[PDB]
Design an enzyme around this catalytic site. Structure first.
Site, PDB file in Angstrom:
ATOM      1  N   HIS A 181       0.858  -1.121   0.083  1.00 15.61           N
ATOM      2  CA  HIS A 181       0.096  -0.055   0.115  1.00 15.61           C
ATOM      3  C   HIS A 181       0.785   1.255   0.038  1.00 15.61           C
ATOM      4  O   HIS A 181       1.220   1.784   1.023  1.00 15.61           O
ATOM      5  CB  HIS A 181      -1.010  -0.189   1.012  1.00 15.61           C
ATOM      6  CG  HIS A 181      -2.045   1.032   1.084  1.00 15.61           C
ATOM      7  ND1 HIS A 181      -2.017   1.973   0.045  1.00 15.61           N
ATOM      8  CD2 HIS A 181      -3.029   0.890   1.702  1.00 15.61           C
ATOM      9  CE1 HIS A 181      -3.235   2.490   0.335  1.00 15.61           C
ATOM     10  NE2 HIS A 181      -4.070   2.165   1.313  1.00 15.61           N
ATOM     11  N   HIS A 184      -2.600   6.585  -0.779  1.00 13.30           N
ATOM     12  CA  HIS A 184      -3.760   7.056   0.301  1.00 13.30           C
ATOM     13  C   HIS A 184      -3.119   8.011   1.293  1.00 13.30           C
ATOM     14  O   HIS A 184      -3.974   7.839   2.393  1.00 13.30           O
ATOM     15  CB  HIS A 184      -4.958   6.030   0.789  1.00 13.30           C
ATOM     16  CG  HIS A 184      -5.699   5.430  -0.632  1.00 13.30           C
ATOM     17  ND1 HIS A 184      -5.945   4.234  -0.670  1.00 13.30           N
ATOM     18  CD2 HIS A 184      -6.210   6.200  -1.755  1.00 13.30           C
ATOM     19  CE1 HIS A 184      -6.593   4.175  -1.944  1.00 13.30           C
ATOM     20  NE2 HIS A 184      -6.534   5.309  -2.574  1.00 13.30           N
ATOM     21  N   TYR A 186      -0.715   6.914   3.482  1.00 12.78           N
ATOM     22  CA  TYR A 186      -0.127   6.161   4.434  1.00 12.78           C
ATOM     23  C   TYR A 186       1.473   6.127   4.376  1.00 12.78           C
ATOM     24  O   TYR A 186       2.131   7.058   3.751  1.00 12.78           O
ATOM     25  CB  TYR A 186      -0.553   4.566   4.398  1.00 12.78           C
ATOM     26  CG  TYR A 186      -2.294   4.516   4.652  1.00 12.78           C
ATOM     27  CD1 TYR A 186      -2.619   4.874   5.749  1.00 12.78           C
ATOM     28  CD2 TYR A 186      -2.857   4.250   3.740  1.00 12.78           C
ATOM     29  CE1 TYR A 186      -4.021   5.213   6.096  1.00 12.78           C
ATOM     30  CE2 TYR A 186      -4.345   4.277   3.796  1.00 12.78           C
ATOM     31  CZ  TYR A 186      -4.921   4.982   5.131  1.00 12.78           C
ATOM     32  OH  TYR A 186      -6.269   4.868   5.264  1.00 12.78           O
TER      33      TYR A 186
HETATM   34  C1  LIG Z   1     -15.119   1.539   3.290  1.00 11.90           C
HETATM   35  C2  LIG Z   1     -13.999   1.760   2.407  1.00 11.90           C
HETATM   36  C3  LIG Z   1     -12.777   1.255   2.534  1.00 11.90           C
HETATM   37  C4  LIG Z   1     -11.581   1.155   1.917  1.00 11.90           C
HETATM   38  N1  LIG Z   1     -10.297   0.675   2.384  1.00 11.90           N
HETATM   39  C5  LIG Z   1      -9.413   0.807   1.483  1.00 11.90           C
HETATM   40  C6  LIG Z   1      -8.022   0.096   1.875  1.00 11.90           C
HETATM   41  O1  LIG Z   1      -8.131  -0.570   2.839  1.00 11.90           O
HETATM   42  N2  LIG Z   1      -7.038   0.049   1.202  1.00 11.90           N
HETATM   43  C7  LIG Z   1      -6.974   0.832  -0.076  1.00 11.90           C
HETATM   44  O2  LIG Z   1      -6.099   0.872  -0.779  1.00 11.90           O
HETATM   45  N3  LIG Z   1      -8.127   1.359  -0.453  1.00 11.90           N
HETATM   46  C8  LIG Z   1      -9.378   1.537   0.292  1.00 11.90           C
HETATM   47  N4  LIG Z   1     -10.563   2.106  -0.148  1.00 11.90           N
HETATM   48  C9  LIG Z   1     -10.589   2.198  -1.358  1.00 11.90           C
HETATM   49  C10 LIG Z   1     -11.065   1.371  -2.216  1.00 11.90           C
HETATM   50  O3  LIG Z   1     -10.052   0.350  -2.594  1.00 11.90           O
HETATM   51  C11 LIG Z   1     -11.700   1.830  -3.734  1.00 11.90           C
HETATM   52  O4  LIG Z   1     -10.342   2.312  -4.328  1.00 11.90           O
HETATM   53  C12 LIG Z   1     -12.552   3.090  -3.602  1.00 11.90           C
HETATM   54  O5  LIG Z   1     -13.743   2.462  -3.123  1.00 11.90           O
HETATM   55  C13 LIG Z   1     -12.864   3.380  -5.037  1.00 11.90           C
HETATM   56  O6  LIG Z   1     -13.498   2.468  -5.991  1.00 11.90           O
HETATM   57  P1  LIG Z   1     -15.342   2.199  -5.800  1.00 11.90           P
HETATM   58  O7  LIG Z   1     -15.923   3.706  -6.345  1.00 11.90           O
HETATM   59  O8  LIG Z   1     -15.189   1.187  -6.797  1.00 11.90           O
HETATM   60  O9  LIG Z   1     -15.834   1.976  -4.333  1.00 11.90           O
HETATM   61  C14 LIG Z   1     -11.713   2.226   0.490  1.00 11.90           C
HETATM   62  C15 LIG Z   1     -12.810   2.384   0.203  1.00 11.90           C
HETATM   63  C16 LIG Z   1     -14.100   2.492   1.081  1.00 11.90           C
HETATM   64  C17 LIG Z   1     -15.449   2.900   0.677  1.00 11.90           C
HETATM   65  O1  LIG Z   2     -10.969   3.189   6.829  1.00 12.08           O
HETATM   66  N1  LIG Z   2     -10.697   3.757   5.833  1.00 12.08           N
HETATM   67  O2  LIG Z   2     -11.285   4.976   5.626  1.00 12.08           O
HETATM   68  C1  LIG Z   2      -9.745   3.812   4.720  1.00 12.08           C
HETATM   69  C2  LIG Z   2      -9.774   4.417   3.391  1.00 12.08           C
HETATM   70  C3  LIG Z   2      -8.870   4.164   2.593  1.00 12.08           C
HETATM   71  N2  LIG Z   2      -8.968   4.959   1.450  1.00 12.08           N
HETATM   72  O3  LIG Z   2      -8.152   5.890   1.006  1.00 12.08           O
HETATM   73  O4  LIG Z   2      -9.753   4.785   0.572  1.00 12.08           O
HETATM   74  C4  LIG Z   2      -7.515   3.476   2.602  1.00 12.08           C
HETATM   75  O5  LIG Z   2      -6.585   3.399   1.809  1.00 12.08           O
HETATM   76  C5  LIG Z   2      -7.509   2.636   4.140  1.00 12.08           C
HETATM   77  N3  LIG Z   2      -6.561   1.699   4.300  1.00 12.08           N
HETATM   78  O6  LIG Z   2      -5.782   1.352   3.607  1.00 12.08           O
HETATM   79  O7  LIG Z   2      -6.250   1.850   5.764  1.00 12.08           O
HETATM   80  C6  LIG Z   2      -8.356   2.783   5.117  1.00 12.08           C
END
Ligand SMILES: Cc1cc2nc3c(=O)[nH]c(=O)nc-3n(C[C@H](O)[C@H](O)[C@H](O)COP(=O)(O)O)c2cc1C
Ligand SMILES: O=[N+]([O-])c1cc([N+](=O)[O-])c(O)c([N+](=O)[O-])c1
Length: 364
Positions: A181, A184, A186
């Site tokens: 990852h 975002h 991190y």
């Molecule tokens: C509840 C939620 C949790 C997410 N958690 C992560 C995460 O754990 N790691 C990550 O890289 N992106 C995370 N994302 C981003 C998703 O991987 C994805 O890129 C994002 O939802 C956009 O696509 P969508 O319109 O198909 O939902 C999260 C998004 C949402 C809605």
């Molecule tokens: O909890 N969350 O809201 C969340 C959201 C995103 N994201 O940017 O869509 C992440 O990448 C992660 N994540 O990777 O931990 C968590």
């Protein structure tokens, strides 16, 4: 009926039977204490195992890497043992699963850090966002992030070694691939972005310095396992959870992608826009990415099936990761194939809780 979404794709060491991937989705349902994956989590993943590839929720490489109450880890014996069940369940259904590994850096709160101390980052600058804690009843609550401490130079090899060790653990736990990852906001992204990285050692300043840590990590995990097991997620154009990509984002993105290509890794996963939106990728920029990377390119961010077909058809991406449609549709592949309607989403139960809003979205 035309259609490339439902055709196979070689993704490093494995072969997906379709191009409809499940995006990494933090859901905050792990056991505490121990940040332990659960049988309920197993079921949720098993329901989605018709995906071309499942990419797991973000999973902490260490206790210091923890950002969220309810996020799982992959450093302890109990975590490894629980993840093994989860991957076996996916494989029982003829699925494939990647573990998304992260260090949260500054998106964290002292109350979930070891010893209750400040979280770490490239520099001592608050993330100016919220993370998710649990209240006294175990319910998820959003709380402002704690200001971090800048890593000392001599702490950086440890961080690389935690990634390497987490990837060894992932292999043992039965994952098919790992996704680093580096998106975002991190830790990896906190180094990449000039906004979050004010260092004046070899880990900050120039783009080569800012990408140094992610590239050390890539090299370490390639060495530990195999480059054909390693994917990476980047979010290098636009702003993501308050972290932009600086004033030369495109050129810096292309530098990073050229560097990654040299390692021959399985895939490049592009998170194109934040949940709050951003400017769409130009086809010109898509073509610049395509010619720089020789493995699989996964696109994500408010995709529809149409957009996915359009872009795979144009030869610009190979697969699409859907997030929220996957929360609400365990059999998304079947529904997209049959052009069925989708279950309505219930965002109030995206984070925390139990089976409600998790395993209770029905298949056809
Ligand atoms: C509840 C939620 C949790 C997410 N958690 C992560 C995460 O754990 N790691 C990550 O890289 N992106 C995370 N994302 C981003 C998703 O991987 C994805 O890129 C994002 O939802 C956009 O696509 P969508 O319109 O198909 O939902 C999260 C998004 C949402 C809605
Ligand atoms: O909890 N969350 O809201 C969340 C959201 C995103 N994201 O940017 O869509 C992440 O990448 C992660 N994540 O990777 O931990 C968590």
């Amino acid at each position: 009926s035309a259609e490339k979404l439902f055709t196979p794709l070689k993704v490093g060491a494995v072969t997906a039977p379709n191009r409809v991937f499940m995006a990494p989705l933090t859901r905050l349902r792990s056991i505490e204490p121990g940040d332990i994956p659960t049988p309920l989590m197993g079921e949720y993943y098993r329901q989605r195992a018709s995906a071309g590839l499942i990419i797991s929720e973000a999973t902490q490489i260490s206790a210091q890497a923890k950002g969220y109450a309810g996020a799982p880890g992959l450093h302890s014996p109990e975590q490894i043992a629980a993840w093994k069940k989860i991957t076996a369940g996916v494989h029982a259904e003829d699925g494939r699963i990647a573990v998304q590994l992260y260090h949260t850096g500054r998106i964290s709160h002292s109350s979930i850090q070891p010893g209750g101390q400040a979280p770490v980052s490239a520099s001592a600058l608050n993330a100016n966002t919220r993370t998710s804690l649990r209240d006294e009843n175990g319910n998820a609550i959003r709380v402002d992030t704690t200001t971090p401490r800048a890593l000392e130079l001599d702490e950086i090899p440890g961080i690389v070694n935690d990634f390497r060790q987490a990837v060894a653990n992932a292999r043992e736990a039965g994952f098919d691939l790992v996704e680093l990852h580096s998106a975002h906001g991190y830790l990896l992204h906190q180094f990449l972005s000039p906004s979050s990285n004010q260092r004046t050692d070899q880990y900050g300043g120039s783009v080569e310095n800012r990408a140094r840590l992610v590239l050390e990590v890539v090299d370490a995990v390639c060495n530990e396992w195999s480059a054909d097991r390693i994917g990476i997620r980047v979010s290098p154009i636009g702003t993501f959870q308050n972290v932009d990509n600086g004033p030369n984002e495109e050129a810096d993105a292309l530098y990073l992608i050229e560097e990654l290509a040299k390692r021959g890794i399985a895939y490049l996963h592009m998170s194109e826009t934040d949940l709050a939106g951003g400017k769409p990728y130009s086809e010109a920029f898509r073509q610049k990415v395509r010619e720089r990377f020789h493995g699989v390119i996964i696109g994500a961010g408010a995709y529809t099936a149409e957009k996915a077909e359009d872009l795979i058809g144009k030869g610009l991406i190979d697969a699409v990761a859907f997030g929220r449609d996957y929360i609400a549709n365990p059999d998304l592949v079947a529904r997209l194939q049959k052009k069925a309607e989708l279950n309505p989403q219930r965002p109030e139960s995206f984070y925390g809780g139990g089976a409600e809003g998790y395993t209770d979205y029905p298949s056809l």
